Design a binder for this molecule. Structure first.
Ligand SMILES: Nc1ncnc2c1ncn2[C@@H]1O[C@H](COP(=O)(O)OP(=O)(O)O)[C@@H](O)[C@H]1O
Ligand code: BEF
Ligand SMILES: [Mg+2]
Length: 341
């Protein structure tokens, strides 16, 4: 009679009663990981006496303390619960976030796989802080790379004779721009073999964590260079052997999810994120493609269609009261993503 409700509940209950061993366990595929990270209220927000309306009372639970008025003007809270594979609170460092989000996926590229990790959320919520880090080394791009190098110099993987390359680009108004090559506008193509090639995208050999941080810092400066969440940034790590691609980790600082204004680049952003949602779900459901395509999902197409492909989504949350409607929007996107599995 009410199976659907029962099932949603089962899924809720299962995602609560879970440890860190489930995602980090190999010996069982965990193709889709979804997390949430609350950032702290900052100085400017405290300066406007903004209320913090988020709590993270467990490693799996996030609470939104939604402020409400009764019809008669009586104030009250609607305390709404959301569960995720992991839930990081206002104290969690980038290193802690990295350890349970992307770090597990590193190994996937070494096993000939394609990985993807997405920072998703409203503008000002911590997407770039998480992935990019002025200081690249405090980010996930850097940390992923650090660990990619350690895996390379392990016994298990020395035999493979692997060279590490990196790419770094920005997707803005459906055009791709190479950030390791002075914002060079590139041309995206569908090969008659149905597969996507970014023409002119510079890959650059790297030998060393610090090399990579050098490249990230350069690409970052090239992004700004003037005067983000206007556009998507994607930083890839490629393992090649004989020029032949072994595996690939694409790490993406998405664009601001907040679009219902009506400068209707916000339409492009919306179709991207809807498409991304469908591609992520397509993943677990070897299933044809994002359905109203976007570049983002063109360029990243290979990293979902694969049989040996993992992904991880990190919903970012601004804890302020004035962000509450955005927060609830971020969380509901995330809900539906995790909904597969
Ligand atoms: N987890 C965090 N801890 C401390 N400060 C943060 C955190 N997340 C974001 N910030 C602050 O927010 C700004 C970073 O931009 P960010 O919010 O990451 O971009 P985006 O709007 O793409 O999410 C900086 O002022 C940074 O110090
Ligand atoms: F929201 Be962003 F500038 F990746
Ligand atoms: Mg940003």
């Amino acid at each position: 009679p009410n199976w659907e409700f029962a099932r949603m509940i089962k899924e809720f209950r299962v995602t609560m009663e879970c440890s860190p061993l489930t995602v980090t366990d190999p010996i069982e595929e965990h193709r889709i990981c979804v997390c949430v990270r609350k950032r702290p209220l900052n100085k400017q927000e405290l300066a406007k006496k903004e209320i913090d309306v988020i709590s993270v009372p467990s490693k799996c639970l996030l609470l939104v303390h939604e402020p409400k008025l009764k019809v008669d003007l009586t104030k009250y809270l609607e305390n709404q619960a959301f569960c995720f594979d992991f839930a990081f609170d206002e104290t969690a460092s980038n290193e802690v976030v990295y350890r349970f989000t992307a770090r597990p996926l590193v190994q996937t590229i070494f096993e000939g796989g394609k990985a993807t990790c997405f920072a998703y959320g409203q503008t000002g919520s911590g997407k770039t802080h998480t992935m990019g880090g002025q200081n690249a080394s405090k980010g996930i791009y850097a940390m992923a790379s650090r660990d990619v190098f350690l895996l390379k110099n392990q016994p298990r993987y020395r035999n493979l004779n692997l060279e590490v390359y990196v790419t770094f680009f920005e997707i803005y108004n459906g055009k791709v721009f190479d950030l390791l090559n002075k914002k060079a506008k590139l041309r995206v193509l569908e090969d008659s073999r149905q597969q996507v090639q970014v023409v002119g995208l510079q890959e650059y050999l790297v030998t060393c964590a610090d090399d990579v941080i050098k490249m990230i810092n350069m690409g970052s400066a090239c992004r700004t260079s003037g005067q983000s969440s206007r556009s998507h940034a994607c930083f890839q790590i490629l393992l090649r052997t004989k020029g032949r691609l072994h595996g690939k980790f694409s790490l993406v600082d998405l664009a601001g999810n907040e679009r219902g204004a009506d400068r209707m680049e916000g339409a492009e952003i919306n179709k991207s994120l809807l498409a991304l949602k469908e591609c992520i779900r397509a993943l677990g459901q070897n299933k044809h493609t994002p359905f109203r395509e976007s570049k983002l999902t063109q360029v990243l197409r290979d990293s979902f269609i694969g049989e040996n492909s993992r992904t991880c989504m990190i919903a970012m949350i601004s804890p302020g009261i004035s962000s509450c409607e955005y927060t609830l929007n971020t969380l509901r996107y995330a809900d539906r993503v995790k909904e597969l599995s």
